[PDB]
Amino acid sequence: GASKLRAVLEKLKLSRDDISTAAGMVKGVVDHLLLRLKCDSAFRGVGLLNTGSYYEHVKISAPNEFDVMFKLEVPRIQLEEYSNTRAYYFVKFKRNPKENPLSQFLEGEILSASKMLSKFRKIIKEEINVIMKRKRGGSPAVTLLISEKISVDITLALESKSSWPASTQEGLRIQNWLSAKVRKQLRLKPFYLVPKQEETWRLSFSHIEKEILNNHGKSKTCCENKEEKCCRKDCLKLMKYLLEQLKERFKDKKHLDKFSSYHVKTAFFHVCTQNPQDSQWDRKDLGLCFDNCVTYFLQCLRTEKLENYFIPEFNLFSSNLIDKRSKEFLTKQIEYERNNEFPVFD
Ligand SMILES: Cc1ccc(-c2cc(C(=O)O)c3cn(Cc4ccccc4)nc3c2)c(Cl)c1
Ligand SMILES: [Zn+2]
């Protein structure tokens, strides 16, 4: 019922909580890079962005993939919304102390992402002497390979400590779950701008995940004792692992390339909004809770609808982001695993 799932989670526990020297290796590369970066005229205000710190992941199946975020404090920033995309913006400056650190990447009044990534990647490429990966880039920006296994996706982010853009006004619908006072508190935190043709930056709220995952119940005491243990975290882990295993089962094909743990996180958090009560997430009901996550995500692929959790009008499952053929393929593959007691969980 929930027995196979529990054992999958027991297997996953014996690799994470099991002495992973991987994170400590990643930390050493990042510390060395930040020191070099802070000596540059444009990157003197650089710093590690805590998304769980150095050990921020994507791959829950294999510790062979880490995702790190660097932040740059960009003050008195003016944002121009590109083509009413709601998520993509141009970065312009108020121009008070004109000769500012990032004035070297300006193309008129607009701040260039490719030219900022150019210097960033160049400084990292020479600081390596750990192997770099030219491959594609863009987003995730720099991709390093520690030894022969560990892969680290470094993303540079513009930090704005001002009110969140108007596109987010109806996003973060946590009022009936985490409360209206928590939503207000989270919305006082900064927002980030990441690169990815035009020199546009998308809004990133990745730092908010940790805030919510570590304090995820309607009850303030959720998972702090015996009678209040919920399966929300276990459902997220199983949803991530499902996509990761499906992405392995078809790694010789192009169909599941556009899908990430991000699509899985977003849909999981929309299930959280839909099911705000801790009783809708009981440990005993792990099987049905996971099914709700699986069902919601299938209804997402089928309708080509998965709204950005912070930007309701930005659709992560639009035809311009992922095609019908890739959505209809993953729909069949999940429906298969669901109708066979999940074979990837063997
Ligand atoms: C309640 C809640 C909070 C945050 C997110 C979220 C939001 C974003 C974003 O960009 O907006 C995310 C982007 N990554 C991938 C990533 C993360 C760190 C470093 C590199 C790459 N993971 C995210 C999670 C979601 Cl979906 C829900
Ligand atoms: Zn809980």
Coordinates of C-alpha atoms and ligand atoms in Angstrom, one line a residue:
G1 CA 0.0 0.0 0.0
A2 CA 2.6 2.5 1.2
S3 CA 5.2 -0.4 2.0
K4 CA 7.1 -0.2 -1.4
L5 CA 7.2 3.7 -1.2
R6 CA 8.5 3.5 2.4
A7 CA 11.3 1.2 1.2
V8 CA 12.2 3.5 -1.7
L9 CA 12.5 6.3 0.9
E10 CA 14.5 4.0 3.1
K11 CA 16.9 3.3 0.2
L12 CA 17.2 7.1 -0.6
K13 CA 18.0 7.7 3.1
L14 CA 21.1 5.4 2.9
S15 CA 22.9 7.6 0.3
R16 CA 22.0 11.1 1.6
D17 CA 22.5 10.8 5.4
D18 CA 25.4 8.4 4.4
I19 CA 28.8 10.3 4.6
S20 CA 28.6 12.2 1.2
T21 CA 32.1 13.8 0.9
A22 CA 30.7 15.3 -2.4
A23 CA 29.2 18.4 -0.7
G24 CA 32.5 19.2 1.1
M25 CA 34.4 19.0 -2.2
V26 CA 31.8 21.4 -3.9
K27 CA 32.2 23.9 -1.0
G28 CA 36.0 24.1 -1.5
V29 CA 35.6 24.9 -5.2
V30 CA 32.9 27.6 -4.5
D31 CA 34.9 29.3 -1.6
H32 CA 38.0 29.5 -4.0
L33 CA 35.8 30.9 -6.8
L34 CA 34.0 33.6 -4.6
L35 CA 37.4 34.9 -3.4
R36 CA 38.6 35.3 -7.0
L37 CA 35.3 36.8 -8.1
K38 CA 35.2 39.4 -5.2
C39 CA 38.6 40.8 -6.6
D40 CA 36.8 41.7 -9.9
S41 CA 35.4 45.3 -10.5
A42 CA 32.0 44.0 -11.4
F43 CA 31.9 40.9 -9.1
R44 CA 33.2 42.6 -5.9
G45 CA 29.7 42.3 -4.4
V46 CA 29.3 38.6 -5.2
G47 CA 28.3 36.0 -2.6
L48 CA 26.9 32.5 -2.1
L49 CA 23.1 32.5 -2.2
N50 CA 21.8 30.1 0.5
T51 CA 19.2 27.7 -1.2
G52 CA 20.4 25.2 1.4
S53 CA 23.9 26.6 0.8
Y54 CA 26.6 24.6 -1.2
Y55 CA 24.7 21.3 -0.9
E56 CA 21.6 22.5 -2.9
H57 CA 20.5 19.6 -5.1
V58 CA 18.4 18.6 -8.1
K59 CA 19.3 14.8 -8.3
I60 CA 17.9 12.8 -5.3
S61 CA 18.7 9.5 -7.1
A62 CA 22.5 10.1 -7.4
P63 CA 24.6 12.8 -5.5
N64 CA 26.3 13.3 -8.9
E65 CA 24.4 16.6 -9.4
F66 CA 24.5 19.8 -7.3
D67 CA 23.1 23.2 -8.1
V68 CA 24.8 26.3 -6.6
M69 CA 23.6 30.0 -6.9
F70 CA 25.8 33.1 -6.6
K71 CA 24.1 36.4 -5.9
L72 CA 25.1 40.0 -6.8
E73 CA 23.4 42.8 -4.8
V74 CA 22.0 45.1 -7.5
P75 CA 20.6 48.3 -5.8
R76 CA 18.1 51.0 -7.2
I77 CA 17.2 48.7 -10.1
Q78 CA 14.5 49.5 -12.8
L79 CA 12.7 46.6 -14.5
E80 CA 11.1 46.6 -17.9
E81 CA 8.7 43.7 -18.5
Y82 CA 9.5 41.9 -21.9
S83 CA 6.6 41.3 -24.3
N84 CA 4.1 40.8 -21.3
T85 CA 5.8 37.4 -20.6
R86 CA 5.3 38.2 -16.9
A87 CA 8.6 36.3 -16.0
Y88 CA 11.1 38.0 -18.4
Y89 CA 12.5 41.5 -17.7
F90 CA 15.2 44.0 -18.9
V91 CA 17.6 45.3 -16.2
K92 CA 18.0 49.1 -16.3
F93 CA 19.5 51.5 -13.6
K94 CA 18.4 54.8 -12.0
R95 CA 22.0 56.2 -12.7
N96 CA 22.8 58.2 -9.5
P97 CA 26.5 57.2 -8.9
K98 CA 26.8 56.6 -12.7
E99 CA 30.2 54.8 -12.7
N100 CA 28.7 51.7 -10.9
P101 CA 30.3 48.2 -10.8
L102 CA 28.0 46.7 -13.6
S103 CA 28.2 49.8 -15.9
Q104 CA 30.6 47.8 -18.1
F105 CA 27.8 45.4 -19.2
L106 CA 25.4 48.1 -20.4
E107 CA 24.1 48.1 -24.0
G108 CA 22.3 51.5 -24.0
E109 CA 20.3 51.5 -20.7
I110 CA 19.8 47.7 -20.8
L111 CA 22.1 45.3 -18.8
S112 CA 23.6 42.5 -20.9
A113 CA 23.3 38.9 -19.4
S114 CA 25.6 37.2 -22.1
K115 CA 28.3 39.8 -21.5
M116 CA 28.0 39.5 -17.7
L117 CA 28.1 35.7 -18.0
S118 CA 31.1 36.1 -20.4
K119 CA 33.4 37.6 -17.8
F120 CA 31.9 35.3 -15.0
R121 CA 32.6 32.1 -17.1
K122 CA 36.1 33.6 -18.1
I123 CA 37.1 34.3 -14.5
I124 CA 35.9 30.8 -13.4
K125 CA 37.6 29.0 -16.5
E126 CA 41.1 30.5 -15.5
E127 CA 40.5 29.9 -11.7
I128 CA 39.9 26.1 -12.3
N129 CA 43.7 25.5 -12.3
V130 CA 37.6 20.4 -11.6
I131 CA 36.8 20.6 -15.4
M132 CA 34.4 23.1 -17.2
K133 CA 31.6 22.1 -19.6
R134 CA 31.2 24.3 -22.7
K135 CA 28.2 22.0 -23.9
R136 CA 25.4 24.7 -24.0
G137 CA 25.4 27.0 -20.9
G138 CA 23.0 29.9 -20.6
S139 CA 20.9 28.5 -17.7
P140 CA 22.4 26.8 -15.7
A141 CA 25.3 29.1 -16.6
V142 CA 28.7 27.5 -15.6
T143 CA 28.8 23.7 -15.2
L144 CA 31.7 22.1 -13.4
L145 CA 32.7 18.4 -13.1
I146 CA 34.4 17.5 -9.8
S147 CA 36.5 14.4 -10.3
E148 CA 34.6 11.9 -12.6
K149 CA 31.2 11.8 -10.8
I150 CA 30.0 15.1 -9.1
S151 CA 28.6 17.8 -11.5
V152 CA 27.9 21.4 -10.2
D153 CA 25.6 23.8 -12.0
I154 CA 26.6 27.4 -11.0
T155 CA 24.0 30.1 -11.7
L156 CA 24.6 33.8 -11.2
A157 CA 21.7 35.8 -9.9
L158 CA 20.8 39.5 -9.6
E159 CA 19.5 40.3 -6.1
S160 CA 16.8 43.0 -5.6
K161 CA 15.8 43.9 -2.0
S162 CA 12.7 45.9 -3.3
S163 CA 9.0 44.8 -3.5
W164 CA 8.3 41.8 -5.7
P165 CA 7.2 42.6 -9.4
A166 CA 3.4 43.0 -10.0
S167 CA 3.4 39.7 -12.0
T168 CA 3.7 37.9 -8.5
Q169 CA 0.8 39.8 -6.9
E170 CA -1.5 36.7 -7.0
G171 CA 1.4 34.2 -6.7
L172 CA 2.5 32.3 -3.6
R173 CA -1.1 31.3 -2.7
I174 CA -0.2 30.0 0.8
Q175 CA -2.9 32.1 2.8
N176 CA -5.2 29.1 3.6
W177 CA -2.2 26.8 4.3
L178 CA 0.8 28.6 5.9
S179 CA -1.3 31.9 6.5
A180 CA -1.6 35.4 5.2
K181 CA 1.0 36.6 7.8
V182 CA 3.7 34.1 6.5
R183 CA 3.0 35.2 2.8
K184 CA 3.5 38.9 3.9
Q185 CA 6.8 37.9 5.7
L186 CA 8.2 35.9 2.7
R187 CA 7.2 38.7 0.3
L188 CA 9.5 41.0 2.4
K189 CA 12.5 38.8 1.3
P190 CA 14.5 39.6 -1.8
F191 CA 13.8 38.4 -5.4
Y192 CA 16.4 37.2 -7.9
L193 CA 17.0 37.6 -11.7
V194 CA 18.6 34.8 -13.7
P195 CA 19.8 34.8 -17.4
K196 CA 17.8 33.0 -20.3
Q197 CA 17.1 35.5 -28.5
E198 CA 17.2 38.6 -26.2
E199 CA 19.1 40.1 -23.1
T200 CA 16.2 39.3 -20.7
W201 CA 16.4 38.0 -17.1
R202 CA 13.7 35.8 -15.4
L203 CA 12.5 36.2 -11.8
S204 CA 13.7 33.4 -9.5
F205 CA 12.2 32.6 -6.1
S206 CA 14.2 29.5 -5.5
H207 CA 15.4 30.7 -2.0
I208 CA 11.7 30.5 -0.8
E209 CA 11.7 26.7 -1.1
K210 CA 13.9 26.1 2.0
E211 CA 11.7 28.6 4.0
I212 CA 8.6 26.5 3.3
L213 CA 10.0 23.0 3.3
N214 CA 11.5 23.4 6.8
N215 CA 8.2 24.9 8.1
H216 CA 5.5 23.3 5.9
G217 CA 2.4 22.6 8.0
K218 CA -0.8 24.5 8.8
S219 CA 0.2 23.6 12.4
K220 CA 3.4 25.2 13.8
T221 CA 4.3 21.9 15.4
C222 CA 4.0 19.7 12.2
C223 CA 6.7 17.0 12.2
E224 CA 8.1 18.1 15.6
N225 CA 6.6 15.1 17.5
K226 CA 4.9 11.6 17.2
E227 CA 1.2 12.5 16.6
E228 CA 2.0 15.2 14.0
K229 CA 4.2 13.5 11.5
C230 CA 3.1 14.3 7.8
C231 CA 4.2 12.9 4.4
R232 CA 4.5 16.2 2.4
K233 CA 8.4 15.9 2.3
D234 CA 8.2 12.1 1.4
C235 CA 5.7 13.0 -1.5
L236 CA 8.1 15.7 -2.8
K237 CA 11.1 13.2 -2.7
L238 CA 9.1 10.4 -4.4
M239 CA 7.8 12.8 -7.1
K240 CA 11.5 14.0 -7.8
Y241 CA 12.8 10.4 -7.8
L242 CA 10.0 9.3 -10.2
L243 CA 11.0 12.0 -12.8
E244 CA 14.8 11.3 -12.3
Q245 CA 14.3 7.5 -12.9
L246 CA 12.1 8.2 -16.0
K247 CA 14.8 10.6 -17.2
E248 CA 17.3 7.7 -16.9
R249 CA 15.0 5.1 -18.6
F250 CA 14.8 7.4 -21.7
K251 CA 18.3 9.2 -21.6
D252 CA 19.0 7.9 -25.2
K253 CA 15.9 9.9 -26.5
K254 CA 15.1 13.7 -26.6
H255 CA 11.5 13.5 -25.1
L256 CA 12.1 14.0 -21.3
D257 CA 15.0 16.5 -21.7
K258 CA 12.9 19.7 -21.0
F259 CA 11.6 18.3 -17.7
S260 CA 13.3 19.1 -14.3
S261 CA 12.7 18.6 -10.5
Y262 CA 11.4 22.2 -10.9
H263 CA 8.2 21.1 -12.7
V264 CA 7.8 18.4 -10.0
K265 CA 8.3 21.0 -7.2
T266 CA 5.9 23.5 -8.7
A267 CA 3.1 20.9 -9.1
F268 CA 3.7 19.5 -5.6
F269 CA 3.3 23.0 -4.1
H270 CA 0.1 23.5 -6.0
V271 CA -1.2 20.2 -4.4
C272 CA -0.1 21.8 -1.0
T273 CA -2.3 24.9 -1.7
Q274 CA -5.2 22.6 -2.8
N275 CA -4.8 20.4 0.4
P276 CA -3.9 22.9 3.2
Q277 CA -4.7 20.7 6.2
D278 CA -2.1 18.4 7.9
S279 CA -4.8 15.6 8.0
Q280 CA -4.7 15.6 4.2
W281 CA -1.0 14.6 4.6
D282 CA -1.0 11.9 7.3
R283 CA 2.1 9.5 7.4
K284 CA -0.3 6.4 7.2
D285 CA -1.8 7.8 3.9
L286 CA 1.6 8.2 2.0
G287 CA 0.2 6.0 -0.9
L288 CA -3.0 8.2 -1.5
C289 CA -1.1 11.5 -0.9
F290 CA 1.5 10.5 -3.5
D291 CA -1.3 9.5 -5.8
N292 CA -2.8 13.0 -5.5
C293 CA 0.6 14.4 -6.5
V294 CA 0.8 12.0 -9.4
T295 CA -2.8 12.7 -10.6
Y296 CA -2.4 16.6 -10.3
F297 CA 0.9 16.3 -12.4
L298 CA -0.9 14.1 -15.1
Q299 CA -3.8 16.7 -15.2
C300 CA -1.0 19.3 -15.8
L301 CA 0.7 17.4 -18.7
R302 CA -2.7 16.6 -20.3
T303 CA -4.0 20.2 -20.2
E304 CA -0.5 21.7 -20.9
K305 CA -1.0 23.8 -17.8
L306 CA 1.5 24.3 -15.0
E307 CA 1.7 27.8 -13.7
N308 CA 4.8 29.3 -12.0
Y309 CA 4.0 29.1 -8.3
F310 CA 5.0 32.9 -7.9
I311 CA 3.8 34.1 -11.3
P312 CA 0.2 32.7 -12.1
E313 CA 0.2 34.0 -15.7
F314 CA 3.6 32.3 -16.6
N315 CA 2.8 28.7 -17.8
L316 CA 5.8 26.3 -17.5
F317 CA 3.9 23.8 -19.8
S318 CA 3.3 26.2 -22.7
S319 CA 3.8 25.0 -26.3
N320 CA 6.7 27.5 -26.6
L321 CA 8.5 25.9 -23.6
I322 CA 7.6 22.1 -24.1
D323 CA 5.8 20.5 -27.1
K324 CA 2.6 18.4 -27.1
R325 CA 4.6 15.3 -28.2
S326 CA 6.9 15.6 -25.0
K327 CA 3.9 16.2 -22.6
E328 CA 1.8 13.3 -24.2
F329 CA 4.9 11.0 -23.9
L330 CA 5.6 11.7 -20.2
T331 CA 1.8 11.4 -19.6
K332 CA 1.8 7.8 -21.0
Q333 CA 5.0 6.9 -19.1
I334 CA 3.6 8.1 -15.7
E335 CA 0.2 6.5 -16.4
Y336 CA 2.2 3.2 -17.0
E337 CA 4.2 3.4 -13.7
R338 CA 0.9 4.3 -11.8
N339 CA -0.9 1.3 -13.4
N340 CA 1.9 -1.1 -12.5
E341 CA 2.8 -0.3 -8.8
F342 CA 5.7 1.9 -9.9
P343 CA 8.4 -0.4 -11.6
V344 CA 11.2 2.4 -11.3
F345 CA 10.9 2.0 -7.5
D346 CA 12.5 -1.6 -7.7
Ligands
LIG1 C1 7.1 27.2 -2.6 C2 8.2 27.2 -3.7 C3 9.4 27.9 -3.5 C4 10.3 28.0 -4.5 C5 10.1 27.3 -5.7 C6 11.2 27.4 -6.7 C7 11.3 28.5 -7.5 C8 12.4 28.6 -8.5 C9 12.4 29.8 -9.4 O1 13.3 29.9 -10.2 O2 11.5 30.6 -9.2 C10 13.3 27.5 -8.6 C11 14.4 27.2 -9.5 N1 14.9 26.0 -9.1 C12 16.1 25.4 -9.6 C13 17.4 25.8 -9.0 C14 17.4 26.1 -7.6 C15 18.6 26.5 -7.0 C16 19.8 26.6 -7.8 C17 19.7 26.4 -9.1 C18 18.5 25.9 -9.7 N2 14.2 25.4 -8.1 C19 13.2 26.4 -7.8 C20 12.1 26.3 -6.8 C21 8.9 26.6 -5.9 CL1 8.6 25.8 -7.4 C22 8.0 26.6 -4.9
ZN2 ZN 4.9 17.9 8.4

